Structures are given as C-alpha cells and as structure tokens.
Amino acid sequence: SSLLPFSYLYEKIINFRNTLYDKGFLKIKKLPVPVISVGNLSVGGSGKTSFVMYLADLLKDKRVCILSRGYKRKSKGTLIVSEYGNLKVSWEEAGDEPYLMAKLLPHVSVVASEDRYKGGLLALEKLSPEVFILDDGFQHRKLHRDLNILLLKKKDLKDRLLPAGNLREPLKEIRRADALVLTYQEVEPFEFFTGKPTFKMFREFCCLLNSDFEEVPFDILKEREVIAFSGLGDNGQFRKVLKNLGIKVKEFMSFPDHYDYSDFTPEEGEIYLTTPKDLIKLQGYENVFALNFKVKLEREEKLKKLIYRIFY
Ligand SMILES: [Cl-]
C-alpha cells in the first residue's frame, strides 16, 4: 500500500491523456490500409502473443505486417525485423517477442518501431502489406485502428492501476474496445458482458516446436524421458504445465530471466524442452524443443466477420 499514492496520481495523468484523445485534442493519425490493434489493460503476456499469431493466421490470404514496439531493443528508429517470414536481424537487435512472432509466422512481416505510424509507413514502402496488426497497441491512441481488440483475463477485473496493481489503464477504458477477447479460459474461466462482441479464448497443447521453429509431433517422446529448463523464473509456470502435461522429466534446470545461453552445453543424444523465448537462443541445437500451444476461440466465425468488414 506504500504504492497507492503513486496509483492515485498516475490515474489522473492517464485520465487526462485519455480525455485529450477522447475529445480530439490530440492528433490521431491514419495509415492508408486497414489496422487491427491487439492489446490489454495489464501488461501483455503469452496471451497477447498467442492471439496475435492466431489472428495473423486468420488473415493468411492477405499480406500481413505486424507492428511491434520493440521493447528491450537497442535504441530506437524503425526496424524491419522480418520480411514475410524471413528474419532480417538477430533476436538481440529486435527483442524476443518480435523475433519470436517473426519465427512463428513464416508468411508475415514484422516491423519494430516505437512510433507505430512511422513503422507502418516504412512497411508500406518496402513490404506493401494489405493489413497491419498492432502488437500491444491498445494504449497507442495516436494511431487510428479500424478494429480495436482488447484482451482481458479474469485477474484484470479485480486488479488496480500501476504501481499498486498491474492495470496500465482504469477498467472503464474498455469502452474503447470494438471486440473483447476473454483469455486464459483454460486456467481461469470467467464470463464478462459488455454488449460488445466478446470471444472466449482457450489455449490447448498442440505439438512441439523444434529449433528451426517448425512444428513436430510430441510423439517422439512417447517412450522417452526429458530434461527441461527455463530462465525468466517462469519455471514454476513451465514446471506446472510440464507437470500438468504428465511428461517424464529426468532432470530440471534453472537460469536467470535474461539468460543468453552464450555457453549452454547440452548432451548429444538427450532431449531438451525449454520455452520459445529461450529456444530463440538455442537454434542450431536439435534435441532442444519448446511446447507449442494453439488458440481455440469461441464464435470464431463472428470474429472473422468483424475482421473482414475492415477491408471495404
Ligand atoms: Cl496476455
């Protein structure tokens, strides 16, 4: 509660900024092709990532470009990370999530830029995309979006504003959404009614990702025991899911959140499972894999209807 004073203050800052946009005091810029924004009130986690890729796959008959912010990316300036699947920089220069999204989306372009509009402009010149997806774009009101998709998990609904809680914005800001996606339905189911189009999102275990980021069956470990490891401190997350997946684990290792694997040294002939975020650093090594999940969205056909209305 030491943090509540900043919380009450932070609320007035955000509300003031939001009031300026609401009332048209600040410029909202428009790119000349459709833009879909995906974001949340709280910080975006694996949920937003899973949904961004799910969404880009619904749009597989369009030239798609993801506009990411580039958190933990050296400096600034617009950067093309991936051209329709082909990575143009290392994960160092681009950050893990845009790199990971790039690796998981073989036909999608990825551009990292703090100013999303300037990113869109570069993409338009060099990539000629037909639709943009704003990764983590709900707060970036300076760029117009034709479809504003807000992800909400159960925990959000009873959270509080930074720094006392995790909300980047008050719950009332939901009004800005054109569509709601209720996430983590596999773990923490809930029902929310706003009168806006709403879609329950489940994630389910699909297959394995090898070190080239291709899907492989998990059947390979039908009669094998596995070593596993993680860095971020998500190993309890990883530990639980592995436990929840009933996978034979021989041994289990832990590393700092940031771990770069400049000196990771695995054993020839053993099999490893790690997180996609860590797998990034371990390309080159076979026998190292990540768990792959797929999104199942209720009323999928409605979402698709909403999406394609932006193309008129
Ligand atoms: Cl999320």
What can be said about this structure in brief?
It contains eight helices and 14 strands. With 312 residues, it is of the alpha/beta class.
Number of domain modules: 1
Given the C-alpha coordinates, what overall shape results? Answer: globular
Rg over C-alpha atoms, rounded to the nearest angstrom: 20 Å
The proportion of residues in beta strands is 15-25%
- Quaternary: monomer
Query: How many extended strands?
Result: 14
- Structural class category: alpha/beta
Distance from first to last alpha carbon: 50 Å
Topology:
Elements: H1 4-22, E1 35-40, H2 46-58, E2 64-68, E3 79-83, E4 86-87, H3 91-94, H4 96-104, E5 109-112, H5 116-127, E6 131-135, E7 147-152, E8 179-182, E9 198-209, E10 215-216, E11 226-230, H6 235-244, E12 249-254, E13 272-274, H7 276-279, E14 288-297, H8 300-308
Parallel strand pairs: 1-6, 1-7, 2-5, 2-6, 7-8, 8-9, 11-12, 11-13, 13-14
Antiparallel strand pairs: 3-4, 3-5, 9-10, 9-14
GO molecular function: ATP binding; tetraacyldisaccharide 4'-kinase activity
EC number: 2.7.1.130
Pathway: Glycolipid biosynthesis; lipid IV(A) biosynthesis; lipid IV(A) from (3R)-3-hydroxytetradecanoyl-[acyl-carrier-protein] and UDP-N-acetyl-alpha-D-glucosamine: step 6/6
